[PDB]
């Protein structure tokens, strides 16, 4: 996150870290055996990391649990990032508490102008490499599809939404992907893409999870 | 010049580590190379 | 057209040539003041060329008429070629005869496996430059969206169709664009794109006009 | 190797004169440059 602030130890308990030997993506605990990330974040032998704050020091609230199964959306388009949703199944069952809590699935789609919370361990400078060990957060509204449509012409599909500032300085960045975009206490987005980080007229692109609740619900219930 | 115009002024990447980047244009990484 | 044959003088009377000083695209006479081409074929000061066979020698059946108005589809996506349709308005009113005849608009969409006729003055060799002065034709069926979907993953939108051979040797090529794809005597496609010309597993991509008959109908009736 | 695999093995052009070509990839004219 660029232009954000440090959340604070477990201020974001549904936030999960994906490690294949190094953190490469974020995710979301939607329940106790299941995690939602972005489909573009798929790899082999993934370790889910729960109750994380300093991702470089064992602080004591962490639960490191390897995946037993990973399912990418059937209509996931690596060329257009359309349907950028993946569901990850924990080998175990995580322990839900103070700092380890799941996120609520959306029942209606948040409208343009709703404030949400974005967060992660991705890059803090639009420029260069400078990766926090701490979990950084950001508050940005849901922009008009009209203005999301003007930023990135011809790339906004019906399963995406721009949240941010047309102005820049504040945005998600490389390492934030798969991470939660929460609004009014229900998960509405998945850090997908953008064109740089906190660049003007280049706000962040997210996955409209509200379009996927049935798939999730369905899938979680059969596997 | 708008957005510093096209010529590989469409390297829309993902926010994964490392990302996957695709250029738009028409005629780790990418970005500048070219223009005209 | 690659792997085609010479149609014959006016065997294809709805076939139109777009010249901005040189032929750059094909088109279709859907009526007498209006021509359908591809949206990617738009330029300024276009001359429509009717009753053409040798596009380098005045043979006598030609009607050269400049456009007064050109309208690109409102949801035309230059990045994905989705909605690749344009409507061109003649300054005059063409004279409809033996060799100058309009094409019929579709009322239902042709199914996979229907044979159609493709034609134009575009390139005849998948390789190199070698532009006929004569109008070349080609017969190829409408493939499954399933197989169009496998050829070009993630690029086939609901407004496109592949017609051809997964095998190659036969296909549309550079200079054919905007041109008619006719089947069962009604226009079903517009030469759009492909990935090379007559390359294996790279069949031609066309515009599903059946999705646009209302827009056409509407537009033609208000302008 | 399938379709002579990716590395700018996605230069899907139009059939206009001159065409407009876009590469797919991820990481007149175009086509070969690169691979790895």
From Swiss-Prot, chains A, C:
Its cofactor is Ca(2+). Ca(2+) binds at residues 52, 54, 57, 62. One of its GO terms (biological process) is digestion. GO terms for cellular component: extracellular space; serine protease inhibitor complex. Subsequent cleavage after Lys-125 leads to alpha-trypsin. Further cleavage after Lys-170 yields pseudotrypsin. A cleavage may also occur after Arg-99. It catalyses: Preferential cleavage: Arg-|-Xaa, Lys-|-Xaa. The active site is at 40 (charge relay system), 84 (charge relay system), 177 (charge relay system). InterPro entries: Peptidase_S1_PA, Peptidase_S1_PA_chymotrypsin, Peptidase_S1A, Serine_Proteases_S1, Trypsin_dom, TRYPSIN_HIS, TRYPSIN_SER. Substrate binds at residues 171-172, 174-175, 177. Synthesized in the acinar cells of the pancreas. Residues 1-221 form the Peptidase S1 domain. Its EC number is 3.4.21.4. Pfam families: Trypsin (PF00089). GO terms for molecular function: endopeptidase activity; metal ion binding; serine-type endopeptidase activity; serpin family protein binding. Is inhibited by scorpion cyclotide trypsin inhibitor TopI1. Disulfide bonds join 7-137, 25-41, 109-210, 116-183, 148-162, 173-197. Belongs to the peptidase S1 family. This is Serine protease 1. The lineage of its organism: Eukaryota, Metazoa, Chordata, Craniata, Vertebrata.
Swiss-Prot record, chains B, D:
Disulfide bonds join 7-35, 8-23, 11-31, 13-21. The record marks 15-16 as: Reactive bond for trypsin. Trypsin and chymotrypsin are inhibited simultaneously. There are two separate reactive sites for trypsin and chymotrypsin but they do not inhibit simultaneously. Belongs to the Bowman-Birk serine protease inhibitor family. This is Bowman-Birk type proteinase inhibitor. It comes from Phaseolus angularis (Azuki bean). The chain holds residues 12 to 73 of 82 of the full protein.
């Amino acid at each position: 996150i660029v232009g954000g602030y440090t959340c604070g130890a477990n201020t974001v308990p549904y936030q999960v870290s994906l490690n294949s030997g190094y953190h490469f993506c974020g995710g979301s605990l939607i329940n106790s055996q299941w995690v939602v990330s972005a489909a573009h974040c798929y790899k082999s032998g993934i370790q889910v990391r729960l109750g994380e704050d300093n991702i470089n020091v064992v602080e004591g609230n962490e639960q490191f649990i390897s995946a037993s199964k990973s399912i990418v959306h059937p209509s996931y388009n690596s060329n257009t990032l359309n349907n950028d949703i993946m569901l990850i199944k924990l080998k175990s069952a995580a322990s839900l508490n103070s700092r380890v809590a799941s996120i609520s699935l959306p029942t209606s789609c948040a409208s343009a102008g709703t404030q949400c919370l974005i967060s992660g361990w991705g890059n803090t400078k639009s420029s260069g490499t400078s990766y926090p060990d701490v979990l950084k957060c950001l508050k940005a509204p849901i922009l008009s599809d009209s203005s999301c449509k003007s930023a990135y012409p011809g790339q906004i599909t019906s399963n995406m939404f721009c949240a941010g500032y047309l102005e820049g300085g504040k945005d998600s960045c490389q390492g934030d992907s798969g991470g939660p975009v929460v609004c009014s206490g229900k998960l509405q987005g998945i850090v997908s893409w953008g064109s740089g980080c906190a660049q003007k007229n280049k706000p962040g692109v997210y996955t409209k999870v509200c379009n996927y609740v049935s798939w999730i619900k369905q899938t979680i219930a059969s596997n | 010049s708008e957005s510093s115009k096209p010529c590989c002024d469409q390297c829309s990447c993902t926010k994964s580590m490392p990302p996957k980047c695709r250029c738009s244009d028409i005629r780790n990484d990418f970005c500048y190379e070219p223009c005209k």
